[PDB]
Design a binder for these strands. Sequence first.
RNA 1: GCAGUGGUGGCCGAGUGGUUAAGGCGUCGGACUUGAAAUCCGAUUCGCUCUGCGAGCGUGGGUUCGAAUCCCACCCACUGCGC
Lengths: 315, 239, 453
Amino acid sequence: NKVERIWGDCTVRKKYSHVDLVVMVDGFEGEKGAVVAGSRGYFLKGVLVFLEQALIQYALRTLGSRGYIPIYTPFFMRKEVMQEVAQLSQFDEELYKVIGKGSDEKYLIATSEQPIAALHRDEWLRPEDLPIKYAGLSTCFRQEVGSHGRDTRGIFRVHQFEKIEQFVYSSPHDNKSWEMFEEMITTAEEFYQSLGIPYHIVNIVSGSLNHAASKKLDLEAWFPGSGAFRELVSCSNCTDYQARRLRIRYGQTKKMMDKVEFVHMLNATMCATTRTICAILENYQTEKGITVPEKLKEFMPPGLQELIPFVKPAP
Amino acid sequence: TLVSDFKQQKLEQEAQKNWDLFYKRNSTNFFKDRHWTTREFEELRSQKLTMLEAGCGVGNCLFPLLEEDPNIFAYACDFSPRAIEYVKQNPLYDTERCKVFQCDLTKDDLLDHVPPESVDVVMLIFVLSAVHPDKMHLVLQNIYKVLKPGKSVLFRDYGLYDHAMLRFKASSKLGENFYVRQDGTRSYFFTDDFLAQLFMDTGYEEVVNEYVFRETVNKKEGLCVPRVFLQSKFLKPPK
Amino acid sequence: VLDLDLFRVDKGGDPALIRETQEKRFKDPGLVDQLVKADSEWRRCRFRADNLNKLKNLCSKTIGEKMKKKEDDLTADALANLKVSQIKKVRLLIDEAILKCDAERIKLEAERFENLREIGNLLHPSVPISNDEDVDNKVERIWGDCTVRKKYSHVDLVVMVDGFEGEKGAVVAGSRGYFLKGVLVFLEQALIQYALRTLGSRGYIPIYTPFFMRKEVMQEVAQLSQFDEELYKVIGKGSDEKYLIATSEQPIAALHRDEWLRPEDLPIKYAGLSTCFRQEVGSHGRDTRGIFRVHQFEKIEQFVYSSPHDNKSWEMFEEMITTAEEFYQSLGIPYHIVNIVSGSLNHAASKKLDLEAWFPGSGAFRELVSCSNCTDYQARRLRIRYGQTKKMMDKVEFVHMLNATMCATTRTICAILENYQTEKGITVPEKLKEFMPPGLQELIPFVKPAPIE
RNA sequence: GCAGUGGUGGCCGAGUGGUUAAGGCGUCGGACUUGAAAUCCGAUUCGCUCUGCGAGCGUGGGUUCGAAUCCCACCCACUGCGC
Ligand SMILES: Nc1ncnc2c1ncn2[C@@H]1O[C@H](CSCC[C@H](N)C(=O)O)[C@@H](O)[C@H]1O
Ligand SMILES: [Mg+2]
Ligand SMILES: [Mg+2]
Ligand SMILES: [Mg+2]
């Protein structure tokens, strides 16, 4: 994996990992959550609900200032539509199935990129409006929560989490898709530089790419209490792989004896709230609590605008 | 408001069972011997003085005054079998000075075990408060027939507005001045007028009937509290 | 469920009162009589099963003693005079009797329980006894102007602001699916921020709940009808006993499940935040379409565990309805408070108040808040005890549990849109301008024409 | 999702095929002591026709006369993997 650029200090180390910090601030309920929902179920409470909401507010305003349109999506999708945006591997391994009455065939979404992709299916887009940018906001549901040590427990790998996505439909001409790809990863990078999270950008190897992706960049943040890099953002350019399966066409008119061109589609995570909360807690821990990042103070309630205090001991 | 009227009936029909299970769970370790008895009453001071102890418990009221003065014969009454067995298994027990027997002072009669007009002093120490307010005169009449016509009856029990009355939560109230403990035993808090007009209705004559005030203090918790017991002596009319 | 001793008349119970309550709720009496007979039979069957168990235990003890000393009117001494083989012969008869008694007892238990789960909570004496909700629902209070009329209903207003995608939503998710987009995502988020901040300042603990509840736990917090036809079922790899929650009150109720709560700190207040998934969406006209009745929506809930003594849960009930009232008064939305009739309460509720907001573009009253006091009906099922210590003789007391919707985001958005429409756009409520982006702090402009026009 | 170890009462923690589920800790009430207490005595899972008997040691089952102890399944943790 080719590391492309570094930002911040990715070697400093601090006392606790997120697995202890979420309990020390009293914002996590894992045992009762596993009683209610089962393995990995969790309640998030108190100061951590306010912090997650502050993250959503800050991400939405950051993306809205850039020209993205916020969009709240449905959380389940008809199977006939989900096939066109997902792979077979995903359905058995990662997609929950929703059953109504009379035994429908809907699936809970794994990411808001899946409903946003189907928002323009079977359409002829006007080339004039093509940099179409959406900021998806939704709850994602994954089945795979396999653990790899203590530092992967807590709220790091869960079945249910809120995520803010970047989704762009782009012209397929003049290398504009790749310029937009660079712009998307730069937007994510600036989001994490303004939060003060150190990271490096990684160029993912061709072996670990999904079928649609023609290139992928991950943003991996440094976790000083865990001593590891963890992936927080994934940026991908799928070109016209999904556009032609969904039949999203570039021009509004077809030429006689000339095949149509499809738009280019790019998606990039902006903020998965649980993982970003983990990174914030690990990077801003002090001896008396967690310092609130300077950019989230305006979105926090009074009383939680300078410090999230420790109220319990570390397990 | 008050305790369920169904529950108060269950408390009345299970009074003896509740006192018996008290002696089962607490053994003879709950109450402590009363050494203040001889000093408090002008009787019992230093010939053959036959005595009846109504509600004898496991002792704790007759064994002190009985090892103190060695010319006293004692009758012991209690409706709980466990208390009688504990009194008998006491090493200080000897049949030549004591005659213990079970007798429900409201249902049973005392003449089945003691001779009429024989006892010269009978003691009621924290026994009448465990009896239902509407069956107390039953006890007074049951003991009226065994008292020598010049003898007397000694009485100490809870009085009105004592602290123990004030600690009771409202869910433990059966009626005016009538409460129930966690274990099922009950507590009636007497007033001078109530006790006077309860003894007068059964043929007694009042001699002394006045409150006794004390206090309880736990230094470690720094708790000092008022206590109000009612002490009295009633006398059976000579002629 | 109700306390079984309310039906035992040999205890302090009275089934006649349960009959009166079951009549006032316009439910089936005689369910009480079926319950009483099933329970009285179950008690005798339990007595017999305990006696058979005692005999089996005594046989095993005697066998053990015979073996270690190196050797059904039965008594202790009676068995002490048998060889081991004979005691085992007796044990076989004991086994047969125990097995048939166990079958009978399991049947009686299931029957008594299926009769008990269909008897409703006792009613607060303030409930209006009736079965006609449209006629006898008592209006308690009114706030604001509930007769003004305005041009568009929410069904048009959500499109004129370009914040709603219905056709594409139904293509993606099916009937009633929708994309919320643009200015209405910011407005929903503003509502969530404002409601969470208000509830947090009142002393509620914000809590983000899981959306999948297990079946074993959902049975204890839900009803037969809901659990049957109202809940979506989730299935993962394997099979799958999980059910998408219909409200955040369901997981929060199971948060202190099977606990002995200290009386100090008893008034625990929770501001639940989750997405709710309801399967029933019926359209009674045009003004109930749009985002008014949907399958998926975010809801902020009040949930309070209270002391069962000293009328504390009813004071808490008034406090919760007052919190919701003040919320909607700061949002500037007119409403009236209605007391629901006996026939419309669900089984757990002793009383239910509803806040019904006036929709000036639709000309109707629509229910936004629903505040219920379910007393110990649910705590007894979940075994949430009021003290930490059990008394010597008294029975265990359970906490009361109240819940009240604070804000369902879609319906409140509809109310705000209908009440703040002008000719050029939607005026932003003064209490939501803190939480809106710059540029969306004074007006949400109309950018499309009305679909009716 | 595998392939290992585990799961005791409000909590900690013993438990050895014949417990009274020990010892603590926490909580709750009762106190009548004249030798009062800088404390003592108790209770503290569910059920029944309650001074007793029955059930309960993650949940269900099996073997045994008898299981909290042995076996199996499932669930949930922790340690290693797959992802
Ligand atoms: N109606 C009644 N007839 C006989 N005994 C009774 C009674 N009501 C209560 N008792 C007995 O009175 C006792 C009160 S405890 C007090 C015992 C004694 N007075 C002492 O100083 O130690 C109880 O043991 C109870 O068994
Ligand atoms: Mg434990
Ligand atoms: Mg113990
Ligand atoms: Mg078991």
